[PDB]
Amino acid sequence: PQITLWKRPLVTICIGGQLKEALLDTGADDTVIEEMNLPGKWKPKMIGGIGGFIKVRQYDQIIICIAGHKAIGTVLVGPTPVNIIGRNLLTQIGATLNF
Amino acid sequence: PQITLWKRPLVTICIGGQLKEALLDTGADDTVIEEMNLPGKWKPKMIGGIGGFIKVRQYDQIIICIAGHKAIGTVLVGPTPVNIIGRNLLTQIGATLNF
Ligand SMILES: CC(C)CN(C[C@@H](O)[C@H](Cc1ccccc1)NC(=O)O[C@H]1CO[C@H]2OCC[C@H]21)S(=O)(=O)c1ccc(N)cc1
């Protein structure tokens, strides 16, 4: 599809068996999902942006369905205000920015 | 151009007549540039990102060239970790997400 940028580019995702709304975010290196009780091993991490840093749990090889497209990779879970699909998964669903 | 996302979508911008590097950021509503001298009037504003809220200087109707494309719009100047070109200006240069 083509997504214009008049509005936030939110799409439906499925992660850990739950549907969420998430931003397709070219400005994010990594995918950051709001606090959820995801199973399995993880590694502590801190990630920084406007305002400072949040503490997240880094999970590897997590399956996510993004707007009907499958992806698998690192997901950071923590107290983000919005669910963020970052470049690590955007590449996997074939996303480009065009102008 | 068409821009893939295996690397950060960094471009050269011209702002205040000065060249800077900035990140094309579909997850940003607004364009936020690091502290710099920029001509004319501004208003104090607060914006929030992943790590909380910061104070910025809001400049309206700023002439900015983004990878050679002309925009004129709002630029927030403040302590952002990274120069970010947000949707307010991505829409001006006709940027869409595609997959
Ligand atoms: C600042 C960027 C270099 C990085 N950010 C992604 C960015 O798209 C966030 C993504 C974002 C979106 C909403 C809320 C928090 C974070 N947007 C953002 O800060 O935008 C601000 C400027 O416009 C406003 O509109 C949205 C918030 C304001 S980030 O969220 O901080 C971030 C940092 C590290 C990772 N792995 C993932 C994301």
Ligand 1 mean position to A96 CA, how many Å?
18
Question: What's the rounded Cα separation, in Å, for the pair A33 and B42?
Answer: 35
SS3 category, A14: strand
Question: What is the rounded distance in angstroms from the CA atom of residue A5 to the CA atom of residue B90?
Answer: 7
CATH number of the structural domain A1-99: 2.40.70.10
Length of chain A as a residue count: 99
Q: B25 CB less than 6 Å from ligand 1? A: yes
Nearest to A5 among B5, B9, B26 (CB): B26
What ranges do the domains of chain A cover?
1-99
Q: Cα–Cα distances in Å, from B72 out to B11, B54, B89, B93?
A: 17, 23, 8, 10
Question: Determined by which method?
Answer: X-ray
DSSP per-residue string spanning A78-95: E--SSEEE-HHHHTTTT-
The whole-angstrom distance between A17's CA and the closest CA on chain B is 23
Q: Could you tell me which chain B residue has the CA closest to the CA of A88?
A: B6
- Ligand 1, residue B25: give the atom nearest the CA: 8
Resolution value (Å, 1 decimal): 1.8
Residue B43 and residue A32: Cα distance in Å, rounded?
32
Q: Which atom of ligand 1 is nearest to the CA of B47?
A: 28
3-state secondary structure chain B: CEECCCCCCEEEEEECCEEEEEEECCCCCCCEECCCCCCCCCEEEEEEECCEEEEEEEEEEEEEEECCEEEEEEEEECCCCCCEECHHHHCCCCCEEEC
